[PDB]
């Protein structure tokens, strides 16, 4: 049924993402979400694919939804901060990278981001 099929779609999406097939990844994750809309990982993965396509608004929306489902999803904050930085929403980006560091203090991407964003906030 739907939940099990949703996971197969996620796996196909992951393989597409690993092969840099960002649009095919979006398509599979979109089907995964249609089949099961209550899994934060599907939204967070779809945000990842959207980032590589420079679909920053869609990435941001997916990250916000992922957080609604699971507020401790670290990658949702990293990805949303990335999108927000692209969209020159620097204080919001810095807030997301700061939250990622609350959840995961050793995260190097987020540490690097905070240093870079100081000049804009």
């Amino acid at each position: 049924g739907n939940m099990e099929a949703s996971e197969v779609m996620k796996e196909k999406g992951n393989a597409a993402y690993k092969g840099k097939q960002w649009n095919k990844a979006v398509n599979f994750y979109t089907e995964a979400i249609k089949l099961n809309g209550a899994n934060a990982t599907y939204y967070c993965n779809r945000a990842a694919a959207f980032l590589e396509l420079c679909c920053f608004q869609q990435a941001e929306q997916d990250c916000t939804k992922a957080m609604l489902i699971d507020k401790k999803n670290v990658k949702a904050y990293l990805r949303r901060g990335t999108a927000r930085e692209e969209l020159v929403r620097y204080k919001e980006a810095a807030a997301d990278f700061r939250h990622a560091l609350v959840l995961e203090p050793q995260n190097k991407t987020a540490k690097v981001a905070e240093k870079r964003l100081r000049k804009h906030i």
Binding site: T41, N45, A48, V74, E104
Partner: peptide
């Protein structure tokens, strides 16, 4: 830990 470039 959390590699942004990897999906889950």
């Amino acid at each position: 830990g959390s590699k942004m470039e990897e999906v889950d």
